[PDB]
Design a protein around this ligand. Structure first.
Ligand SMILES: C[As](C)(=O)[O-]
Length: 144
């Protein structure tokens, strides 16, 4: 159906909301490997909060914060996700309710990562956007 990419719509919304300066965006254009929004985050040009916010607006997804998560994992399995994978992709299973896996995710526009999670777990997902470092903190607190 194919109108514009989720990343493109997020970048456009960052500009329009003035969470990103057009001068900064023009300077950003690879090469660590690095997606555009990744590079903006790494150059210090978009805050984690405004990244999360905008991802949530564009994709219509709920936002979840660190107040909402307890000190140890809730219960449930969950297969196919190594601790390393969680850390690399910055996402974290946080619960299972009505036959769906609640997944806290930094980069909900990344269809490669999501399709990886869908295939590895074999579970239907419910995506919740979280600030990158908050997800990282929970992964470590809950594991390693
Ligand atoms: C470890 As889980 C599926 O119960 O957040």
């Amino acid at each position: 159906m194919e109108q514009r990419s989720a990343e493109t719509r997020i970048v456009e919304a960052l500009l329009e909301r003035r969470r990103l300066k057009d001068t900064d965006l023009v300077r950003a254009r690879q090469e660590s490997g690095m997606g555009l929004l990744a590079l903006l985050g790494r150059l210090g040009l978009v805050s984690e909060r405004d990244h999360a916010e905008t991802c949530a607006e564009v994709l219509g997804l709920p936002l979840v914060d660190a107040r909402q998560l307890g000190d140890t994992p809730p219960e449930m399995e969950v297969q196919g996700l190594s601790l390393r994978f969680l850390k690399q992709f910055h996402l974290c299973p946080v619960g299972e309710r009505d036959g769906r896996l609640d997944l806290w995710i930094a980069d909900p526009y990344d269809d490669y990562a999501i399709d990886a999670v869908r295939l590895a777990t074999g579970l239907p997902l419910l995506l919740h956007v979280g600030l990158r470092s908050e997800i990282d903190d929970l992964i470590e607190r809950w594991y390693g």
